[model samples]
Target: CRHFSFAEIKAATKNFDESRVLGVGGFGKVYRGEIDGGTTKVAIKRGNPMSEQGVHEFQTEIEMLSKLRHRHLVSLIGYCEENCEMILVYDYMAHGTMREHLYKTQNPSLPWKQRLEICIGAARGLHYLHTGAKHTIIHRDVKTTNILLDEKWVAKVSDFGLSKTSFGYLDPEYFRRQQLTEKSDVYSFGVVLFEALCARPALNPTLAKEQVSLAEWAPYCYKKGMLDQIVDPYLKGKITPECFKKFAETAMKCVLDQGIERPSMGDVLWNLEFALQLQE
Candidate 1:
């Protein structure tokens, strides 16, 4: 893959003006730009050199994307490694991110069918990473924010900075070393699904003030049959009981305390597909 010249990117982004900036996060700022005769609208992620993790993430993303190929995964167009800057370019997603669609204050409420389809799309993407490939790749960070939506609202998994590929499941010693595996990805997926169902931010500012983490509160709500209490009020019975139960049960399994108890990405994919059929 050819690298993008810093000069070329600077011109494309109009010298990185605030107006070109699309989104900002802990790792870096994503700017919207046009390249190649202004025909392609691309997202340029400029890593924050000041942060050590940011540098690692940039390199990790470049390394992972350079080797892997999947339709559901976000396409990495190009990158730049010069002028004390590490920048990544990706195909632009017009519909923004699943996070915005699910929780943004001003965004239109996502219908249950749309949300279910998004979940299925995300699961298919993760399935490709976890089992469809020769080597299993774990997306250590699988939050809703990492799931991008294109013009037609198709879901594409993005942000491979925390990815790790292994020949087989990590051993007990290796697993004990850190939380990195298909199961870990499943756990993150559970959080995303929880947000979709609840239509709430992964972290509730008001509840966090009361010494409760969303992670802790969500599982409790799931177990207590108070799904209605936690579910997105906007949906309001639009989803059938069977469909809701199916997703909620799968989400709970993904979030089990014991990693071994969590469903594999393959099983997750199957469940999502089954849920989609049920919705139909």
Candidate 2:
């Protein structure tokens, strides 16, 4: 385990000043920090102690991420566990989370190729977790915010606070008694894909009044041949009709309400890679 002293971390983060702050979520705040004599800029995630689950997730992340290594997965550089503090250090991604790029009010226009690449990178990371590793891992909370984009715009999956072994063979009765397999991650990835295609929140307040989820609403539009309605207008016809249909159909498959009906990460990767090739 690469460990850093509390003092070292504090110095790198300028004592966790507000200026270095990047983003915050249910787990904790993410801060940008410079380490190794300012040669490296890292993201430091500190878990909230007030929440028991947060604390558990913090420990779980450190344990799981320490063993994971993949180009599409965020690299854990070091950590500090002292004075009841659970801090994680990772490579900082310049483009920030996919969420910021996809859903901001003033969303930037991303070309079809770039968007497809992002989807592929994210899928590769999840594919590694679900199948490539010795023991399959499930990223319980897969979402756009957890997908970090580096300086070169490469996608890196981050945050393993809720990761666990996949329950591939669990029966419906068993799942009723406990959380089921990697399908849960597939479900979350579906939401991310939905956001990527539509450039909207997973649950928009205006749309919520219709008793619908983005997942439900998106597929509904896709089936009605209103794919353009669900796509981000900022795209401005940049993507081909065939590519749009492929992406929309894949997104719908991932988000099917029935867990068993959802495609595996392997299938998701296949379709996404195929779509990219078609676009090229």
Candidate 3:
């Protein structure tokens, strides 16, 4: 809950040198920096001049993290809001974002069990935000990129109450009334679940125009008894068919057009546990 000074933030990140860049996105650039006399490393997210996350989002993220604490949720170390600068510091996830493991990274392929556990961890993290918060909180954007991993690869949901893109991961009603709810997060999470199952990106531009959206392609595959064809090749012969069926069924339900049809976060959490148990 400490408010870090601009000078201190600038010093920690070494004036935001290019070599220190950790990640880049619409919101801003993240720099890997050290604090407490270089004893502690942290990721620093600074609001870009054109960032969609302005002062409001910055304060909201800080305030929300300040009030909530969870083992599976990224912890806010502190923030800097001086001289029109907006920056947030968080525990440095040594393993990087889950997206890195899923798509383009040198990280070794994750086993089926590890992927399922990661999803369950994220489900619990999201469940807390929706039901455990003082008020119902919606993670407007939920995707692998928003989920990170620690040195031990324990899944920790990050960028809570945050971004853009993640096309196939969005809820259909997103454009209907421009209203968001816990269902939105659930729907997006469903896509992430599939991503874990199949090791595919949410949207791939290289695919045929219409098929670029995994959301559309997945439903088609699931309905046609072709889910196995789409399943990640690495998981071949490694999963129990029954567990895959139950897990995939739940994920499909979450992406249903009718938000009411989607399972609650608690239900999602439970189902994920069931899937893992099936693995055993």
Candidate 4:
């Protein structure tokens, strides 16, 4: 990845205008930037001075993302470390995030088959991270927001920040044992799987007590033979029983309290692909 000067970054973002902001994250704001006289488009994430991540995390993100090159992993274009500023440049994801499409957004509801493809794509990216690379990389924060979609709706796992996120998709075992592992990512991803199926957030405080936590509720429903009731209305009858059963079983295994019980990313990918085949 190239090293971009802060001046070039400033120029691309037009002095960090609010209108150019794409989204706000734990670190700071993500701006839509264009360089080379507007021929190249990129997403620039500028870390706030008081943010949780500092120099070490920034360097780790660059090191991991810069070395990784996969179809389902977001590309790290460059970085700006000049003038005591930390900024990351990435390929602009045109369709925003998977969370936006899942619920509470104007984005059209994704068909069951399309959602399966997206899940499989993200699983491949994470699987690659776990085994394909020279070093085993555990994506500590794997949530719907970190999974972006391109113009073609291809899923690209983004944000390689080396740490935990806010409330909601965290792995219970990681919290209890204080041991971070690749299965932690699987647990969080299982929440995303339920989120996709239910068309709801991981944690919704506004809902009834039992429905507040999709992670718990989904497994409860699955065990109680009521999984069909909690499925997104748009996908209620659209998903074939074989595919739904496989997907639900896969997701349930992922959210198991014990990390040892969680499926490897490779296994997750295989089952998701098989679920898609069942759907077809």
Clashes of each: 0, 0, 0, 0
RMSD value for candidate 1: 4.0
Error of 3 at 191 (Å): 0.3
TM-score of each: 0.90, 0.90, 0.93, 0.95
lDDT string, candidate 3, 144-262, tens digits: 98899998888888875462115777788878857777889899999899888888899888988756877777877889998888888888889998788889888988888878788
Instruction: State residue 250's C-alpha deviation in candidate 4, in Å.
Output: 0.5
Model 1: per-residue Cα lDDT over 1-280, one tens digit each:
5599999889889999899999887668889999997999999988877787988898888888887777678989899987788899999999888978877668999899899889889998999988776699888778878889999898999989878882111223335646556777787787788888888766655655532444556678767777677678899878877787788888878777677888988898788778877877
Model 4, span 1-280: residue lDDT tens: 8999899998999989998999898777999989888998999999854554566667778888877899999999999988778999988999999999989998799988889899899999999989888878888888899999999999999878774314678888876888888999899889989988999889889998988889899999989999999899999789888999999999999999999989998899999988998988
Best by lDDT: 4
- Which residue pairs come into collision in candidate 1? none
**RMSD to true structure for each model, in Å:** 4.0, 3.6, 2.4, 1.8
Q: How many angstroms is residue 257 displaced in model 4 relative to the true structure, after the best TM-score fit?
A: 1.0
Model 4: lowest-lDDT 10 consecutive positions: 48-57
- Per-residue lDDT value at 134 in model 4: 83
In order, the Cα lDDT scores of the candidates are: 0.80, 0.80, 0.85, 0.89
Question: Where does model 4 exceed 4 Å of error?
Answer: 50-52, 163-165
Q: Candidate 2, residues 124-243: lDDT per residue as tens digits?
A: 999999887778898876778889899999999987877787221122333464756788777778778877878877766554554246766777777787768667787757776677
